Write a protein that binds this ligand. Structure first.
Ligand SMILES: COc1cc([C@@H]2c3cc4c(cc3[C@@H](Sc3ncccn3)[C@H]3COC(=O)[C@H]23)OCO4)cc(OC)c1OC
Ligand SMILES: Nc1nc2c(ncn2[C@@H]2O[C@H](COP(=O)(O)OP(=O)(O)OP(=O)(O)O)[C@@H](O)[C@H]2O)c(=O)[nH]1
Ligand SMILES: Nc1ncnc2c1ncn2[C@@H]1O[C@H](COP(=O)(O)OP(=O)(O)CP(=O)(O)O)[C@@H](O)[C@H]1O
Ligand SMILES: Nc1nc2c(ncn2[C@@H]2O[C@H](COP(=O)(O)OP(=O)(O)O)[C@@H](O)[C@H]2O)c(=O)[nH]1
Ligand SMILES: [Mg+2]
Ligand SMILES: [Mg+2]
Lengths: 317, 424, 54, 433
């Protein structure tokens, strides 16, 4: 019998994970703030990592890697890619500048692009909407030439779910999701945002396309496959981002152990080239997928430390 | 601090005290004459705690025997290890106390108490550093109950900075001698709440049950109960009598077991319950020890929450197994341990086992379930008091119903406090 | 890079390797506090002994 | 010369001191009798070893130390132990009653009754000193004597020896390796009262020691001895500089200068090979990298998630500057050693060539070289957090508080102390992120 605690009541994912842990008859939820737990499904904010790994005779596992924020906050991601030798200055991340600072450079660039240049924080004249707003932000090259789902002239984004267990094995869930946009207009402005939120169901149920239909669409309209045209680059980008920060978040020799489920967000342009948009640390899931993914989280991330065809692609050992 | 001073008051008190001196005199290699005859040095390293060294090796239990009737103490002088006791230290009246709290506390006991305190001074003054006192008594009769608590007060007046410790036998209808027992108990619980630092609650009910429905003894005698008692007393006094990691004192125990001044009423448990050629396994000892069927109170710990716990493991075993099993009991049933006292279960190991046993485990709990014991008594008390029954025996000794009323209230309060912390 | 301040000795070496440049009370008072605790202890003892005498 | 008086308060300290001094004697070649065949300067010598050991006409080298506990036992062992002849009666001072794991009892009640006596004995030692650098104080955080008397002594030492420096070697409470239930309280209290009387404190978490003793030395249930021996080694490493020829940390003052940025941020994290005798020799690189393995630390923390403000490397054995530097580079590239923006990122290195000694029959293997790293990471604050949190759990219900109020203390001290710890945690959070 293993004991666990729950400290993010909003996590749909780990709500489900706790439900199945209970449903196995060998796990028992304790009250939050009980120290003597095997597994923590902690909070997204100010998680007390400094307190794991000191319960005598208790192996302790937590569902968040400490330090990954550097990849899951926008400005932090830009700083990370730019100043990492493993990530050059790369070809899969849209040109980016952080401003509150890297103001000048931004302008410099704009100029070089205003000599015959759309950006996002979406406009084309350097104007800012940041100073008349809130926090730190980042000016990013807007992808003006996206690959459009043509029986609708639509925008989309791909979302992939990536699990990192305690051994820093990187697994890609075989099922990703396409969040699909009203047609596109290179002049004006909701469609441009593929966010379901904004979106709210014509072509796709809840403006969501799964991988089978995307594969048939590329096969039938473009004579390629999802794997060849896009998934080789998704797996490359994931491996790069994650193997990059490994020396700084690995719990290999730590007094406690970490796993974590990430949601990578990619855009494809019309040359079938994948670009990293954002890494999300506390992702949701496609509802049809909630069942499968959560079980895999118990299969490869929890019961691997607490013992009781594969839905994951091993990107890492 | 070092030396303990031991006091036996009343029938039950002198019976369990005499057994305790037999048991630990055996453990320490002291024959009935006071001569050491044991192998290990471990037996004599802390013998100063319970024995005063005298003349040719002779060791004398630092014990004071007290009663208002000469019977049980004659019985003691006569029996096994009967003459290990300093003959001066027998202090006894002739009247008796008639299972009457008022008599032991206010009238007959008051005559005898000064001669007791005399012997107490003589022993305390011959000590390098007196830790405090340990008293054995029942709460249901008259001498032990009332005179014992009176002594507790007297001694505290004279040694307010020392530790008061009692093994107090709680009465139960299952094993009763008189109907007034609830009164007597409620009166001394009152005193104990105020004037002891640690009272081990030995409930006759549990000893009965464990004799009947576990040792499977259909007709238990007071000796059957008292062997459970002497086993427990050896157990919980071990780390005070033997060298080791946690050299224990009475104060540190108190400091480590009593989060709040009044809640100082402990539940002892013991494994293996005897009455044994196969030694058990650490896992066994451990789980037996934490089960209710091994508690010497009557309360089920699964009904409340452990505030503090101390376990002692005696014999030759793996400390690795001991730590694993202890953390397994907690981590598994982490619901029954309060979260506002971190790391509240401590464990000690001593190599010397009790007699007859090769491996053994004793356990001391400040658990909120003790409220059950107190509640039981409160009820019994009320029943009678509500109709002012059998009160004449006490009123005719100068007492007033108000005293009783106060006592009841106090015990009721105790229960409340305990509950308060069960919901925290 | 920069290795500086190398002291060599028959029993040791010592040195500094830089990698990147930057960017009371009173006996009295105490005694007092101590004596205040002492007297506080005494008050409670008094209360006790009084209660005990009652 | 520049002598260092060492005071050992409480069981932990006394017992640890025993170990340390034994090692010391083995390391310097002093025999239990006090004789050091090597000393050709009989009855004297301004040599380095004399910073810790004085000398008699008969050629006895005596530890400049004071062992103090409020209970006869333990010190009594010393008094009747293998090295008993080394020490002098007055140096060992015992009381009659412990502090029942209560700071109050030790700091106030029982302390006031012995403080002056101890202080006197120290003076005796100070008078035999021509240039006292200061004091090295070894104690527990959870014990009553170890917390209370220590705190008092500190205050007083800061009064009777003001300009002298005081360094600490403290034992952080770990649930395992025994622990009262109130150690958290006692710990915070003593820290509050000592914070400004100590210039550098080396905290050692028994949890960490235990683990190492279990893992790297395969001991199922480590004993205080097992642990203390390891600890002593580490202490030696830190204390060698003052007992041997060298140029790093040869004065108690240096420690602060090189490790303590602001007065309160004065708790360096220490990391030390720990092998069983059963033979793969390790390399400067290898050992230096371990200095960055979190499992080899005396306090369990994740430095990576925290920033550095100072780092000294103290090697012992066959080690040459080059190898060191090389290693550093490599490590720099591989591991993450982020510093605060206002600190230089260099590593201050020292080497005593005198190779490490082992206690015969001990569990540590004799080794050809070793390193003790000393860093200032904001990460050490984690160990404060843990303590603070436990303290809070108990204090919110006032659990056990009566035991302290009954000894003279006021609930306020608790709060004042806690707040001080709250302040400390912030200071760290600042210098850090
Ligand atoms: C003879 O009775 C015993 C008494 C005790 C108590 C006690 C009770 C507790 C507790 C801890 C302690 C520790 S304190 C300590 N201080 C510094 C370092 C390590 N430890 C003991 C030391 O000396 C004692 O008297 C204490 O956590 C909750 O309840 C323990 C025993 O075994 C476990 C006993 O044997 C059954
Ligand atoms: N590492 C190590 N820790 C010890 C040793 N002795 C005690 N401890 C630890 O010290 C803490 C208790 O402090 P002690 O030094 O034993 O107590 P003390 O200062 O004598 O205080 P009192 O006995 O209450 O007067 C506990 O956390 C134990 O883990 C030791 O020899 N080595
Ligand atoms: N450089 C760029 N070029 C084109 N579109 C971009 C873009 N950066 C962001 N977007 C668009 O912005 C939308 C919102 O995603 P974005 O990453 O900017 O905020 P977000 O945090 O809400 C994503 P999520 O909800 O998945 O975490 C994406 O669906 C994408 O269509
Ligand atoms: N366990 C145990 N309980 C006893 C013994 N003798 C009496 N009792 C219980 O103690 C109470 C009677 O008190 P007793 O000791 O005879 O009276 P006293 O001489 O006036 O103090 C009743 O609750 C009895 O059940 C005994 O030897 N062992
Ligand atoms: Mg009777
Ligand atoms: Mg002690």
């Amino acid at each position: 019998m293993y004991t666990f605690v729950v400290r993010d009541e909003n996590s749909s994912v780990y709500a489900e994970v706790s439900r199945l842990l209970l449903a196995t008859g060998q796990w028992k939820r304790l009250r939050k703030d009980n120290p003597r737990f095997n597994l923590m499904l902690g909070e997204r904010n100010r998680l007390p990592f400094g307190r794991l790994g000191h319960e005598p005779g208790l192996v302790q596992l937590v569902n968040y890697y400490r330090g990954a924020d550097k990849l899951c906050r926008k400005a932090s991601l830009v700083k990370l890619i730019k100043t990492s030798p493993e990530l050059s200055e790369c070809t899969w991340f849209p040109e980016s500048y952080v401003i509150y600072d890297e103001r000048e450079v931004f302008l410099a660039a704009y100029n070089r692009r205003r000599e015959g240049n759309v950006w996002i924080a979406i406009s084309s004249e350097a104007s800012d909407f940041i100073d008349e707003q809130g926090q730190v932000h980042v000016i990013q090259k807007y992808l003006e030439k996206p690959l459009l789902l043509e029986p609708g002239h639509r925008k989309f984004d791909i979302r992939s779910w990536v699990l990192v267990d305690h051994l820093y094995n990187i697994y890609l869930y075989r099922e990703g999701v396409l969040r699909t946009s009203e047609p596109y207009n290179s002049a004006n402005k909701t469609c441009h945002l593929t966010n379901h939120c904004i979106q709210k169901g014509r072509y796709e149920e809840g403006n969501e396309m799964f991988f089978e239909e995307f594969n048939q669409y590329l096969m039938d309209a473009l004579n390629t496959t999802l794997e060849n045209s896009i998934l080789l680059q998704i797996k490359h980008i994931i491996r790069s981002c994650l193997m990059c920060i490994e020396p700084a978040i690995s719990t290999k020799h730590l007094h406690y152990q970490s796993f974590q489920l990430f949601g990578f967000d990619f855009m494809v342009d019309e040359e079938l080239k994948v670009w990293l948009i954002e890494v999300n640390g506390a992702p949701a899931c496609a509802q049809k997928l909630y069942a499968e993914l959560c079980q895999g989280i118990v299969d490869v991330a929890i019961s691997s430390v607490f013992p009781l065809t594969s839905i994951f692609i091993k990107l890492h050992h | 601090m070092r030396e303990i001073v031991h006091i036996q008051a009343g029938q039950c008190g002198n019976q369990i005290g005499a057994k305790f001196w037999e048991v630990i005199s055996d453990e320490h290699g002291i024959d009935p004459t006071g001569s050491y005859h044991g192998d290990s040095d471990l037996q004599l390293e802390r013998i100063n705690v319970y024995y005063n060294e005298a003349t040719g090796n002779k060791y004398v239990p630092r014990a004071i025997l007290v009663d208002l009737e000469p019977g049980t103490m004659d019985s003691v002088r006569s029996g096994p290890f009967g003459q290990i006791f300093r003959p001066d230290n027998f202090v006894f009246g002739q009247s008796g106390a008639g299972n009457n709290w008022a008599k032991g506390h206010y009238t007959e006991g008051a005559e005898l108490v000064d001669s007791v305190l005399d012997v107490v001074r003589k022993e305390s003054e011959s000590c390098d550093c007196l830790q405090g006192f340990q008293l054995t008594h029942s709460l249901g009769g008259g001498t032990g109950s009332g005179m014992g608590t009176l002594l507790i007060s007297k001694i505290r007046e004279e040694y307010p900075d020392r530790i008061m410790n009692t093994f107090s036998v709680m009465p139960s209808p299952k094993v009763s001698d008189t109907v007034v027992e609830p009164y007597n108990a409620t009166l001394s619980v009152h005193q104990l709440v105020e004037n002891t630092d640690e009272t081990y609650c030995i409930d006759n009910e549990a000893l009965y049950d464990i004799c009947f429905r576990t040792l499977k003894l259909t007709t238990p005698t007071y000796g059957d109960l008292n062997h459970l008692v002497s086993a427990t007393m050896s157990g919980v006094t071990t780390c005070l009598r033997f060298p080791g990691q946690l050299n224990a004192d009475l104060r540190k125990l108190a400091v480590n077991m009593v989060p709040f001044p009044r809640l100082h009423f402990f539940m002892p448990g013991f494994a293996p319950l005897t009455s044994q050629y196969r030694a058990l396994t650490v896992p066994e000892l451990t789980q037996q020890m934490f089960d209710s069927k091994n508690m010497m109170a009557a309360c089920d710990p699964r009904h409340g929450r452990y505030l503090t716990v101390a376990a002692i493991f005696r014999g030759r075993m793996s400390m690795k197994e001991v730590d694993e099993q202890m953390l397994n009991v907690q981590n598994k049933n982490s619901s029954y341990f309060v979260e506002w006292i971190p790391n509240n279960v401590k464990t000690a190991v001593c190599d010397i086992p009790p007699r007859g046993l090769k491996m053994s485990a004793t356990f001391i709990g400040n658990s909120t379930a003790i409220q059950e014991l107190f509640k039981r008594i409160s009820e019994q008390f009320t029943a009678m008091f509500r109709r002012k029954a059998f009160l004449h025996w006490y009123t005719g000794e100068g007492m007033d119903e108000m005293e009783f009323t106060e006592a009841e209230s106090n015990m009721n309060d105790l229960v409340s406090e305990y509950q308060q912390y069960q919901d925290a | 890079m920069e290795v500086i301040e190398l002291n060599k000795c028959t029993s040791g070496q010592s040195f500094e390797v830089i990698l990147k440049p930057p960017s009371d009370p009173s006996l009295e008072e105490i005694q007092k506090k101590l004596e205040a605790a002492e007297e506080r202890r005494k008050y409670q003892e008094a209360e006790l002994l009084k209660h005990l005498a009652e | 010369m520049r002598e260092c008086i060492s005071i050992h308060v409480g069981q932990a300290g006394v017992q640890i001191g025993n170990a340390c001094w034994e090692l010391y004697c083995l390391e310097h070649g002093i025999q239990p009798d006090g004789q050091m065949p090597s000393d050709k300067t009989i009855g004297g010598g301004d040599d380095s070893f004399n910073t810790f050991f004085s000398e008699t006409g008969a050629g006895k080298h005596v530890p400049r130390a004071v062992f103090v506990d409020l209970e006869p036992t333990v010190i009594d062992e010393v008094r009747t132990g293998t090295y008993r002849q080394l020490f002098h009666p007055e140096q060992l001072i015992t009381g009659k009653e412990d502090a029942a794991n209560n700071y109050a009892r030790g700091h106030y009640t029982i302390g006031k009754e012995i403080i002056d006596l101890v202080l006197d004995r120290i003076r005796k030692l100070a008078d035999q000193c021509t240039g006292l650098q200061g004091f090295l104080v070894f104690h527990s955080f959870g014990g009553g004597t170890g917390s209370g008397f220590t705190s008092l002594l500190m205050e007083r030492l800061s009064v009777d020896y003001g300009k002298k420096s005081k360094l600490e070697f403290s034992i952080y409470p770990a649930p395992q390796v025994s622990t009262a239930v109130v150690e958290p309280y006692n710990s915070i209290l003593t820290t509050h009262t000592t914070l400004e009387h100590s210039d550098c404190a080396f905290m050692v978490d028994n949890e960490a020691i235990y683990d190492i003793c279990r893992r790297n030395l395969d001991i199922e249930r480590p004993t205080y001895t097992n642990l203390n021996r390891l600890i002593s080694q580490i202490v030696s490493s830190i204390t060698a500089s003052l007992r041997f020829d060298g140029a790093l940390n040869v004065d108690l003052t240096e420690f602060q200068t090189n490790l303590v940025p602001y007065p309160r941020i004065h708790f360096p994290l220490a990391t030390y090979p720990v092998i069983s005798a059963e033979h793969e020799q390790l390399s400067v690189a290898e050992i230096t990298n371990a200095c960055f393995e979190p499992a080899n630390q005396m306090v369990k923390c994740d430095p990576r998630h925290g920033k550095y403000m100072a780092c000294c490397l103290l090697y012992r054995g066959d080690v040459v500057p080059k190898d060191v530097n090389a290693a550093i580079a490599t490590i720099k590239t591989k591991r993450s050693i982020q510093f605060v923006d206002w600190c230089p990122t260099g590593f201050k290195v020292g080497i005593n060539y005198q190779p490490p000694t082992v206690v015969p029959g001990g569990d540590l293997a004799k080794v050809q070289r070793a390193v003790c790293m000393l860093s200032n990471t904001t990460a050490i604050a984690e160990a404060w957090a843990r303590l603070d949190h436990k303290f809070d759990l108990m204090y919110a219900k006032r659990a056990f508080v009566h035991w302290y109020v009954g000894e003279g203390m006021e609930e306020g001290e608790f709060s004042e102390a806690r707040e001080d710890m709250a302040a400390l945690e912030k200071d760290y959070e600042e210098v850090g992120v």
